[PDB]
């Protein structure tokens, strides 16, 4: 089956729910208004995140793994990066 | 193996673990004093789960899947019930 | 492939990243100023967390499963010790 992982903030709220399907993660939000497709579009056969604010800001860290390597994907608000995890 | 999903809330805290075995998602809780079988109980392989607090009220969303089929479960303090959640899979 | 899960607290942040690899859990840790591995290590196959602040200090609770067994791992600042938590 597909694995999913899921993070939220705020009361709203604005939830990210992000799926590994046949090697694939990808993204899906909610705002308050409906479902869409996030931005999110990375490789992996599983998924994990964590989200924290600074204010009203958004900092996500998506761990998308396949085999034994993980990477780490980050979200400040302004386009997806890799980041500096390592195992 | 089994697979489980965890959230947890406030500072006592309230914990709420989510275990799929074979095909079958159920809950359990803990609020301060012991843990105990929660009100969930759905079909799935895999889960996973957030939560978020409006002042002191509790919602928890539970995202199950069987196959490529995602579904999400809500509690907003009155009894879990299917949401709008949908992926294109 | 591995399994992992993450949980994250306050603003600086503080993370902790588990995963699950050939039956043994372990854990990476970023607290601002580098990536390093955490005291955590116990057996699994699958692995979920939760984690809370009371006041500045954080509560971690790591749910390791090997077939239809859970263990909760518990970390309150002075090593990490088994829960009570039990399934069916
Ligand atoms: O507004 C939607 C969006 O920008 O929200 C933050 C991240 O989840 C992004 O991937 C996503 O596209
Ligand atoms: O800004 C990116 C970064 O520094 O954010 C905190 C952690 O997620 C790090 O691994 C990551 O490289
Ligand atoms: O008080 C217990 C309970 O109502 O808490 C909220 C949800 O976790 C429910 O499934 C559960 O039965
Ligand atoms: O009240 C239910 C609901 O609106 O809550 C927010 C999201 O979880 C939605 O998918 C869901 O339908
Ligand atoms: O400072 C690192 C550390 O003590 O943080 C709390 C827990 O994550 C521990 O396993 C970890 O070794
Ligand atoms: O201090 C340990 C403990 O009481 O913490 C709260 C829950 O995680 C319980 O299962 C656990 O035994």
Redesign the interface.
């Given at each position: 089956?597909?694995?999913?992982?899921?993070?939220?903030?705020?009361?709203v709220?604005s939830?990210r729910?992000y799926?590994a399907?046949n090697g694939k993660i990808?993204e899906?939000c909610?705002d308050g208004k409906?479902?869409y497709?996030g931005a999110f579009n990375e490789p992996?056969?599983?998924?994990?995140?964590?989200?924290?604010?600074?204010g009203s800001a958004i900092?996500i860290?998506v761990?998308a793994?396949?085999?034994?390597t993980?990477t780490?994907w980050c979200w400040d608000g302004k386009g997806w990066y890799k980041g500096?995890?390592?195992?």
């Open positions: 089956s597909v694995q999913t992982a899921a993070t939220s903030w705020g009361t709220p939830i729910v799926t399907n990808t899906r909610w409906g479902w497709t992996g056969d599983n998924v994990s995140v964590t989200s924290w604010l600074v900092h860290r761990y793994s396949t085999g034994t993980t780490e500096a995890y390592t195992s």
